[PDB]
Ligand binder design. Structure first.
Ligand SMILES: *Cc1c(COP(=O)(O)O)cnc(C)c1O
Ligand SMILES: O=C(O)c1cc(O)c(O)c(O)c1
Length: 811
């Protein structure tokens, strides 16, 4: 149908049709008289999967023969979403399968909608890991993603009476056709026990054993016949475990609970034992796998030439002392050699500077769970602080600031300090964030070892986030500049030469409007909500946090409503304001914010004087598959975190690529995006990082803003008095009290400038042609924010390997 989706050759279509029928009969054990759409989805998935495995087997065979340097990307989260369409796109099968299914009397888009999201992440960190696997395969790197196969991913969000309710995401219920269980490569992991010192060195004994069973998922590159592996571990009890009889069998659940459920905290540290077990479990199983593979290719001097381990945040930081434990206690390397190998192997990516996200584990937990690792950590710390003492003699304060051991009521290990000490490279995820690391939180470490500190600005994959979710936009671009941009996103710069082309302007605007109509229809169908598709689609989708300032959006929404009520017959640009995202189950303030948004909705959406000029919708159950629908439909992207708090963001980049303009602060990657597009083509507002520091020095007093801005005062008086909660007048007192007395994120300080910036947005939207021209300028400069660029930089500057766009042999 459209050229970017590949060829529908008669031979191929014919062969897909017979394999589809073969799987329905032999695999699913159904006939067409009893088959549901779900059976048809599974028949298709198995048909597509068969095309992967030939390339999968020869990719891994190729790596065995050529023995390249291997990249191990360790993460506790991989937020994969759906796999079917991605696989078709990457294999050039999408049109062929569409035709094949059409000829069987089936609508492929309907079958795509049956697939569950693999929701094994919380938000940005997990999604980024998935983006990265796609780019690593596309760039021909011998890369492996290693994580945990959680039985339950991020919870499904239900809204009941305006309140978030959680339910278990039972994503494996119908089976996962993409994974292959590999029970033959099951490995033991140890916990508890104690350390004995012999003349033969330390021995870790009397441990409890949990088994790690791997499940492999294929990760295909974009049209290059490379298929890499994501290996996810599942926890199994050994068969002698607890072995009255019945209770011993049932107690197997204790061990298997390790892989049961993803911790639902985005950017927040909860020091629970089960979480620590998950962290060690992934690390210990992964490292044995790495070492096995290395030995099949005494001399660990070559280990860093053959292995790179990338730590995604501090969650797998125990890789450092585990690698030392294996090298020293089991392989009998001397400490200094082992440490050299470790440092050259490991690299650490930091994802946030917020203190509540920092992992600081109590010593007593490590003492009980991982007694050998604690000893190793103490030894690492002592040798590290000896180096600090020699470099800065007499600076005793530096010694306690830099220590891996934090003193206090409870002693803790700072895992970020551990990662810096044991890694040859430490990076932030956007220029401003990487600079913040060197200036503030890791300043001491930067002074000791400046060479370690890098930047690697994040990116997103143009496969999932353009071709897959916005085929219309991909096509009209391909018409003008061809298809090479899909794996070389800088080629979008060629679109600058079409900024005055009247046909292009019209096509860009038509794609947006088609996307908006499709999404408006989706809203009616699944959620009984009727919206104006000629309104500006103003969207804020991301996890609910105080730092992301969904509350600032709320204050703007209420300002618009109040302004309409004051002058009802004045023209205003119509808006549909959409806000979506999950709150962590125990994050009470985030849950109150969700309730506020729905409460504003209840008032605004049923006020006849407003009509269809303002609508406020809370998008329920925001997840990767919902992102793929709403982002192509957006006009305005809300990226309004307090300056200095959002390390990078990736959502911001997705919107930029899909033809939305951005309203935001000079935070995270917004800075580099505005720099690429030109500040004239971005709606920047609010305090810079430096203004926030100055406000902190003087002391933030929110009452000042309340006293001098009458529009703000009116909103606070509405919230306090029960305007948005008549049955429960005091319902929002915690929100008001936070805003007035304890606001770490300075919502009121950016209110005036935000409101004025929003007026400029409205002004521009009234002139469709100039709106669309500015959109073209954003899309055309979004090339830097490809994850292919990011990964090429990791490969060259950290891992020491060369990317490649060269095909491997088909079929
Ligand atoms: C991209 C994405 C995120 C990250 O969005 P930010 O705005 O950068 O926080 C979170 N969740 C999902 C489902 C995504 O696709
Ligand atoms: O501020 C909090 O108490 C908080 C913040 C979070 O981001 C979170 O996931 C949580 O469970 C609690």
């Amino acid at each position: 149908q459209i050229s970017v989706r590949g060829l529908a050759g008669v031979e191929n279509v014919t062969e897909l049709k017979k394999n589809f029928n073969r799987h329905l009969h032999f695999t699913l054990v159904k006939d067409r008289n009893v088959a549901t759409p779900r059976d048809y989805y599974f028949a298709l998935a198995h048909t597509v999967r068969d095309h992967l495995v030939g390339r999968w087997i020869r990719t891994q065979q190729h790596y065995y023969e050529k023995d390249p340097k291997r990249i191990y990307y360790l993460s506790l989260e991989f937020y994969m979403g759906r796999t079917l369409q991605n696989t078709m796109v990457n294999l050039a099968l999408e049109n062929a399968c569409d035709e094949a299914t059409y000829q069987l009397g089936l609508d492929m888009e309907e079958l795509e909608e049956i697939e569950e999201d693999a929701g094994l992440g919380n938000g940005g960190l997990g999604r980024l890991a998935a983006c990265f696997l796609d780019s690593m395969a596309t760039l021909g790197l011998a890369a492996y993603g290693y994580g945990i196969r959680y039985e339950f991913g991020i919870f499904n969000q239900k809204i009941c009476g305006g309140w978030q309710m959680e339910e278990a995401d039972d994503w494996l219920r119908y089976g996962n056709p993409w994974e292959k269980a590999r029970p033959e490569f099951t490995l033991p992991v140890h916990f508890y026990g104690r350390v004995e010192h012999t003349s033969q060195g330390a021995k870790w004994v009397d441990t409890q054993v949990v088994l790690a069973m791997p499940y492999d998922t294929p990760v295909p590159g974009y049209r290059n016949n490379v298929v890499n592996t994501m290996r996810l571990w599942s926890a199994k009890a050994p068969n002698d475990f607890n072995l009255g009889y019945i209770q011993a069998v049932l107690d197997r659940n204790l061990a298997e609970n390790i892989s049961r459920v993803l911790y639902p905290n985005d950017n927040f540290f909860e020091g629970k034992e089960l979480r620590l077990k998950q962290e060690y479990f992934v690390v210990a199983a992964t490292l044995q796998d790495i070492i096995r593979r290395f030995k099949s290719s005494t001399n660990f001097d070559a280990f860093p030439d053959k292995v790179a381990i990338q730590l995604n945040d501090t969650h797998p930081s125990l890789a450092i002392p585990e690698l030392m434990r294996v090298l020293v206690d089991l392989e009998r390397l001397d400490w200094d050699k082992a440490w050299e190998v470790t440092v050259k192997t490991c690299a650490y990516t930091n994802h946030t500077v917020l203190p509540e996200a920092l992992e600081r584990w109590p010593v007593h937990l490590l003492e009980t769970l991982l007694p050998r690792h604690l000893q190793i950590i103490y030894e690492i710390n002592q040798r590290f602080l000896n180096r600090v003492a020699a470099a800065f003699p007499g600076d005793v304060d530096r010694l306690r600031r830099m220590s891996l051991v934090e003193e206090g009521a409870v002693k803790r290990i700072n895992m970020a300090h551990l990662c810096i000490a044991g890694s040859h490279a430490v990076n932030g995820v956007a220029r401003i964030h990487s600079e913040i690391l060197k200036k503030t939180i890791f300043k001491d470490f930067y002074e000791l070892e400046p060479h370690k500190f890098q930047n690697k600005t994040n990116g997103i994959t143009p496969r999932r986030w353009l071709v897959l979710c916005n085929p219309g936009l991909a096509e009209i671009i391909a018409e003008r500049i061809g298809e090479e941009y899909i794996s070389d996103l800088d080629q979008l710069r060629k679109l600058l030469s079409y900024v005055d082309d009247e046909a292009f302007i019209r096509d860009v605007a038509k794609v947006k409007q088609e996307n908006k109509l499709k999404f408006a229809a989706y809203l009616e169908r699944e959620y009984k909500v009727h919206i104006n598709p000629n309104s500006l689609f103003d969207v804020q989708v991301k996890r609910i946090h105080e730092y992301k300032r969904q509350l600032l959006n709320c204050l703007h929404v209420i300002t618009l409503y109040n302004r309409i009520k004051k002058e009802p017959n004045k023209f205003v640009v119509p808006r549909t304001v959409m806000i979506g995202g999950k709150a962590a189950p125990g994050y009470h303030m985030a849950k109150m914010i969700i309730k506020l948004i729905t409460a504003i909705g209840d008032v605004v959406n049923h006020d006849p004087v407003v009509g269809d000029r303002l609508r406020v919708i809370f998008l329920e159950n925001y997840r990767v598959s919902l992102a793929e629908k709403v982002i192509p439909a957006a006009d305005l992207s809300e990226q309004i975190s307090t300056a200095g708090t959002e390390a990078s963001g990736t959502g911001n980049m997705k919107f930029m690529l899909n033809g939305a303009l951005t309203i935001g602060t000079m935070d995270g990657a917004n800075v580099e995006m505005a720099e690429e597009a030109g500040e004239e083509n971005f709606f920047i507002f609010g305090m810079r990082v430096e203004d926030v520091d100055r406000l902190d020095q003087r002391g933030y007093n929110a009452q000042e803003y309340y006293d001098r801005i009458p529009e703000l005062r009116q909103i606070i008086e509405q919230l306090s008095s029960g305007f948005f909660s008549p049955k429960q007048p005091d319902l929002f007192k915690d929100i008001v009290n936070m805003l007035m007395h304890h606001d770490r994120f300075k919502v009121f300080a950016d209110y005036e400038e935000y409101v004025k910036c929003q007026e400029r947005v409205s002004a521009l939207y009234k002139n469709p042609r100039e709106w669309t021209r500015m959109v073209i300028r954003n899309i055309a400069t979004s090339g830097k924010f490809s994850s292919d660029r990011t990964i090429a930089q990791y490969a060259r500057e950290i891992w020491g390997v060369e990317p490649s766009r060269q095909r491997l042999p088909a079929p």
